[PDB]
């Protein structure tokens, strides 16, 4: 139940589909080690691993749900790692696609009721609600998201 296995667990469907490069997992772990991405929300801790590099073939969001939170060092420094159960692996090939999706997730995170239900949903329900939220906006077109990219961890 370490962070490296979580990175591999969420990277697996993107390497199989061809959304990211085969060595993507190593680049994103090195990125997390150099610059951690843990966030302490007023609700539940969230991590958003991303590499911002040129290895990724296309844009994708991979969403993992953990029953047993893992300590991720904070984005905004601080001495206390944040326990994270929800992991958003973000792939994209430009600065703008990553930043716009970061803004979109920001709007998602501050929706308290969504997050509270999110903690207790099946993988298909997560797929439907995230898919709906992505499609509702006119931006963020061209980012792949499929049922295979939403999974529970153990």
């Amino acid at each position, epitope marked *: 139940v370490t962070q490296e296995d979580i990175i591999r667990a969420l990277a697996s469907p993107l390497i199989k589909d061809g959304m990211v490069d085969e060595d993507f997992a190593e680049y994103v772990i090195a990125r997390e080690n150099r610059s951690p991405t843990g966030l302490q929300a007023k609700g539940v801790g969230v991590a958003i691993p991303h590499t911002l590099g040129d290895y990724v073939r296309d844009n994708a969001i991979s969403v993992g749900i953990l029953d047993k939170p893992v300590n991720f060092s904070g984005w905004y420094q601080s001495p206390d790692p944040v326990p994270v159960r929800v992991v958003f692996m973000l792939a994209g090939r430009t600065w703008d696609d990553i930043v716009i999706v970061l803004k979109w997730i920001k709007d998602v995170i501050l929706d308290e009721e969504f997050m509270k239900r999110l903690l207790n949903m*099946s993988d298909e329900e997560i797929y439907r609600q995230i898919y709906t939220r992505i499609s509702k906006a006119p931006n963020l077109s061209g980012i792949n998201f499929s049922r295979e990219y939403v999974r529970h961890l153990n």
Partner: antibody
Amino acid sequence: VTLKESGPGILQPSQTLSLTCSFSGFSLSTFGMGVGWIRQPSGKGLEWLAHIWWDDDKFYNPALKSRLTISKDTSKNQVFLKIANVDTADTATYYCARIGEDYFLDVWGKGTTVTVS
Amino acid sequence: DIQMTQSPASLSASVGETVTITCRASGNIHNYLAWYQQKQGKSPQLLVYNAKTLADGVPSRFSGSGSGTQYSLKINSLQPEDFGSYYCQHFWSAPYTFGGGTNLEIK
């Protein structure tokens, strides 16, 4: 909103059967909707075989994955179940049932009987 | 793969008593559980969904309960129309496997 089923009555072992579900009053293109298949051997309980969601993805029970294929056709409101290499053990009642929004089998057909000679 | 256990193997009850049945999951499935009743020669019908919410057209005497991995159904003031085979279904992840069920017989 009535579901209807049709298929072979008595078939020979090892061939492939094709069970067709007709839909009426319901559209299979609607977000959140889908349909599945239920098998009930005589004298036994029921078991889940497969279902399809509005987006044409597919899920199959791993134990019988090698023998299940479903072809979805929104036009003419049809779902085709192809079951290969039928064994003696596959004699059962089959049902077409809607998966339903919020995950529940609200509408059921009358069922059909499949007997392996 | 998620497996599920139905208990007891069979129940024995008379008309007018309140009885309960239990469905226990092998993993944490939250509230993605539904209960159905099948009559001999008839297709199963839905009783309760989302573990606790009663479906339209189903009498209020049906009530779901439980939490986590263990859920139950209580049926009060049992009437002749309510006897048959009861099943639970779990919608947490595919395959959507079923329990073994129980036969409730008129005594």
